[PDB]
């Protein structure tokens, strides 16, 4: 689990998965 | 090893979603590119230092004009990450032998006469 070069770190951070927000919260609506 | 990068052509294919996102058009493309350097040649391989020295982009931002023909694009596809390319716009036409000394290039990329 070695460390990464810093620029590879930034590339991994910027390209991180962002999930699609659900239209409504399930708790307060089916 | 570290080697020159051959970019697949698939990337250089404007989509119907890209066309309305920038002020362009598939048909009737644009004559000249206005190109500026926004990154250092240092810390990059020599086959980019030489390209930049050839396109006249030695100095920093300092915009410079080039043809939009594939013989030059092949060079700009190697240094595409150290430059900003915008398309020159001529909404008043090429200047005449008069109005050469009274031109001006606005930040939007339009060449105009008498400011």
């Amino acid at each position: 689990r070695r460390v990464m070069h810093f620029q590879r770190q930034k590339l991994m951070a910027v390209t991180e998965y962002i999930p699609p927000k659900p239209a409504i919260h399930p708790s307060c609506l089916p | 090893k570290f080697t020159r990068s051959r970019i697949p052509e698939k990337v250089f294919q404007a989509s119907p979603e890209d066309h309305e996102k920038y002020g362009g058009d598939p048909q009737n493309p644009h004559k000249l590119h206005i190109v500026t350097r926004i990154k250092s040649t240092r810390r990059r391989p020599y086959w980019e230092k030489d390209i930049i020295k050839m396109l006249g982009l030695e100095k920093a931002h300092t915009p410079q004009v080039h043809k939009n023909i594939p013989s030059v694009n092949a060079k700009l596809k190697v240094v595409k990450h150290l430059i900003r390319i915008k398309p020159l716009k001529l909404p008043q036409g090429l200047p005449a032998e008069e109005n050469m000394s009274n031109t001006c290039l606005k930040s939007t990329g339009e060449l105009v006469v008498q400011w």
């Binding site: - | 250089f12 939009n68 023909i69 700009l76």
Partner: protein, 81 residues
């Protein structure tokens, strides 16, 4: 220690550069000519420019020498009287 903690400012800087280069991708997928159309249209200018380089390189030679410059050095003893 060795690992770092990539900030938000760095992410925003990187996204700025990514967007600029995506625009660059776009402005290179539409050339005015094709490979065959362009061929030769700049030949005359290139030939004349290299001929200018040649004529510059083949003109080196010592400068002239004038008698006036040599005799002007006698002025280093000019006196009033």
């Amino acid at each position: 220690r060795r690992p770092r903690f990539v900030s938000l400012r760095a992410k925003q800087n990187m996204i700025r550069r990514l967007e600029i280069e995506a625009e660059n991708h776009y402005w290179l997928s539409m050339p005015y000519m094709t490979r065959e159309q362009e061929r030769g249209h700049a030949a005359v200018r290139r030939r004349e420019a290299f001929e200018a380089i040649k004529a510059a390189a083949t003109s080196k030679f010592p400068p002239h020498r004038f008698i006036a410059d040599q005799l002007d050095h006698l002025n280093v003893t000019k006196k009033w009287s």
